[PDB]
Amino acid sequence: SGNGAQGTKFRISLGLPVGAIMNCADNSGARNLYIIAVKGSGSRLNRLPAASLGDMVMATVKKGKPELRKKVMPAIVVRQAKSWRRRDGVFLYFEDNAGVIANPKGEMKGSAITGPVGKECADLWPRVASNSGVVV
Amino acid sequence: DLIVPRRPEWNEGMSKFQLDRQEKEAFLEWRRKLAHLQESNEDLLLTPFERNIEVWKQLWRVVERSDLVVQIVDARNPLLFRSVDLERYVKESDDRKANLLLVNKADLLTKKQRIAWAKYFISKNISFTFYSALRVMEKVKILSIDINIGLVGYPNVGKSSTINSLVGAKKVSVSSTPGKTKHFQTIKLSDSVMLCDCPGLVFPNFAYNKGELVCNGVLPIDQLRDYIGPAGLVAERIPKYYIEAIYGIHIQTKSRDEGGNGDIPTAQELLVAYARARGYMTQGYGSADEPRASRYILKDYVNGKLLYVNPPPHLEDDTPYT
Amino acid sequence: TLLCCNCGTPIDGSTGLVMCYDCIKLTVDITQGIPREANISFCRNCERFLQPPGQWIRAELESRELLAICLRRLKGLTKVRLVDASFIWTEPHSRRIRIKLTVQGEAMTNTIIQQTFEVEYIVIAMQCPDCARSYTTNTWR
RNA sequence: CUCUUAAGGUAGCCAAAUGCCUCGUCAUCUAAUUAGUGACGCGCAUGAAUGGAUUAACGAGAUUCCCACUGUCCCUAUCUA
RNA sequence: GCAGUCAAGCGUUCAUAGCGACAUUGCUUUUUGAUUCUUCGAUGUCGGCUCUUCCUAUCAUACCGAAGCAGAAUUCGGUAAGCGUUGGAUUGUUCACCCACUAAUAGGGAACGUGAGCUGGGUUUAGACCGUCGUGAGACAGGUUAGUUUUACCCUACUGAU
Ligand SMILES: [Zn+2]
Ligand SMILES: [Zn+2]
Incomplete structure (x- = not known):
């Protein structure tokens, strides 16, 4: 988990x-x-x-800016549709699985994030929290 | 600048060893200039100069024994196909010389282009003649009618099919590849003359090496990997309506109006209107594959279906007019 | 209007850029993970050469597929967007081969920088095991 | 000039259902392809009604890829006769 | 395939910190070769899926020792087999190669484990096509395509129940 992950x-x-x-x-x-x-x-x-x-994954790009694709790169998820559970008992789920490109140390590639972002990723990666407008 | 070496002193002596070595050294020191002009300009620019001892030795079997050599050139961009110092070179034995270059396959250029372009050669008082080989000013285009003979040319500019308008007997191999005709053949016809061709070569055309226009037949289009330069050049030419005309595809409404593409899109917005209209998709996800659709438009750009011509020696906006 | 943030003095542009060109030239490197000398093998009877496990390519000296074998040789050159792998001349009798390579390794953050680096390929003589054993006489087919 | 009694693979096509070497070489598709496609061809051993080449349409024909689709799978669970 | 003794000599001068001659003794059946000893009035023959157990010649993990072992990082070495040792592209494939994660992606055996357990892609019938051979029927361990996979209710074992 500690590929630049804080906690x-x-x-x-x-x-x-x-x-x-x-x-x-x-x-x-x-x-x-x-x-x-x-x-x-x-x-x-x-x-x-x-x-x-x-979580951090290895990902490939299948649509966009052909200087990006046909290569592997690290990515970080920020939304998923599978309902998980916070320790306050509540369940929650987004409507789309969505992620972000990053470097292996946790730094992002872009400059801002469209859509909401999970608390469970923002607390873990600060650079994600910096480039995010909506946290849940 | 310098292109072709000399043919020094066959001289009628002895020592097969010597006749070998005095040309082998010539080659070893001919290429020196190539390396001298290699790092001469920046440290990247480098045109397709072959370094094959065998063909460079075969070229020393043909031209002198022919003593009357003639050039073949595609009629779409005739400066780079021409050799600068071949004129300078074929003036060394003090006998019948003066290659007197010619051009070939002139059945694509129009009336008000061909005369103002003959002014180019004539203004520089040099020799030439137009010749439609598949099918001083008082001419238009002269027919098939108009001592050994040389016949040199660039790869697959039509040299291997020019003879099919002379005898029409299918004597020499030909396809659309730049490496077919080899092992020179002295084709006999009209016994008062004897004709010899050579294997193909590629000479030191330093002008336009990286950002150029040698995606005609020089590098193998059937084996390319850049797919943006060799495709994006066709985008700068051939206005948007003509690719909409032939193929019938819908490219773009000029969406990105900033400095991304603007008018005249690049080799990412039209190639994806072709493969997506041809169904050529990748392995894993539906995505319009570019580099294997760029080889289905580039074999149409060079054969003669999609036409673009050179402009005058000065920078000119729009010489061709479809 | 920024500072080089490594040395400090170089006020550069806001086209999207990083520490000073001298600072990235001297301190930062993106061609690591390769030896600059490469020993290959070669016969002295059939002029053949190979990768360590594979068939002998049969290519003659100064052929296009020299670049194929030379890229197939295991370095990290494949990792990063190869381009402009033209040949440099070397003496045939001094038994060395030279190539200049250029890969576009990413700088800190989406700033693409050229790289001009060189490698030398040296060759040692073998006798070709398949070419030999064959001259030896064991069981026939 | 020829050698065997005759002629000496023409037009065309190709690692093809014909290619041993062979996972041939190059490019491309892929994160990765002994597969697939395009091109090259001294072709073990292609080839012209022992028919060659190309072909729209058709095909419970063989093969590859993509969109959609899903318990095929992750990874199993439950219901009925 | 693995191990031990001699170790020319390479290893900043510093024969084993390490790698390597000449050989020499010798191990396992987890490899080919050789035998034809058992089966020719049925031992169902490739691989894969599944599942269990064992071996150690240890890939990782634990504890130690030595290093041109400052630290860090590595290498070698000793006991040690308790626990674990992958997801995928191509291929019928065992084998192989490549991508990626990973602490690690070690090697092997049980009738070359395992078809009344599955599958049937391959091989290995008959159909048919090409190439080469042959006058011809026909051959090819060469390529390609299509091609029926049976029975447990018995004894024991095992799992559970009286
Ligand atoms: Zn600086
Ligand atoms: Zn050899």
């Missing part, structure tokens, strides 16, 4: 596995992100890994 995050329901295509929410010119693998993942036979809110 330790509680567990969140694994929404979007590999093969998933989530929107991009930054102004980097990318319009979607195809997840291929995950950081901090565990290894079990025939279990394909998965990514939850706040």
